N, CA, C and O of each residue as an XYZ file, in Angstrom:
56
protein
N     -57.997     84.251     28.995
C     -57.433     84.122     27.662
C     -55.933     84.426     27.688
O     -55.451     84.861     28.734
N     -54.944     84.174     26.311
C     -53.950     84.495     26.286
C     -53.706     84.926     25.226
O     -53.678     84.229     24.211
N     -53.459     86.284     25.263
C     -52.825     87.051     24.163
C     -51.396     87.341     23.883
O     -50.495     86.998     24.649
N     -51.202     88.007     22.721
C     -49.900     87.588     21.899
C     -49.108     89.327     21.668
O     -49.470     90.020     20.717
N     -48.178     89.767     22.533
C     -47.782     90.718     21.779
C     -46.040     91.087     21.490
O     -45.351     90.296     22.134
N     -45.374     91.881     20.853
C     -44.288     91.382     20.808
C     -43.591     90.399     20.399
O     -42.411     90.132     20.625
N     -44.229     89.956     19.892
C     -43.776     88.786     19.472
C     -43.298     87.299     20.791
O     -42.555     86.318     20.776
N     -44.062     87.813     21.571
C     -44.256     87.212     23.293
C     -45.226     86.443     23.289
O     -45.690     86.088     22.205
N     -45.618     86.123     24.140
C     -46.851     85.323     24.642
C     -47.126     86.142     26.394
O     -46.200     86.346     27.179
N     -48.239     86.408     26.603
C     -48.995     87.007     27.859
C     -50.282     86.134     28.435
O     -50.936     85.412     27.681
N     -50.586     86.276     29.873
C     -51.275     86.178     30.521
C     -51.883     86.733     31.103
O     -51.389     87.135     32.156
N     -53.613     87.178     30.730
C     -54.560     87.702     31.770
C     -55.727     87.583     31.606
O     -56.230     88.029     30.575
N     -56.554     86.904     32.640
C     -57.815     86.402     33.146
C     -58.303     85.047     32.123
O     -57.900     83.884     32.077
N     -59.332     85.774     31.364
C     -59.915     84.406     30.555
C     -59.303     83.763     29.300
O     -59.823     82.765     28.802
């Protein structure tokens, strides 16, 4: 998945 923090965008696993 990809989650959202910071107003960022992230990467980890599903």
């Amino acid at each position: 998945r990809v989650r959202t923090r910071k107003g960022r965008r992230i990467r980890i696993p599903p």
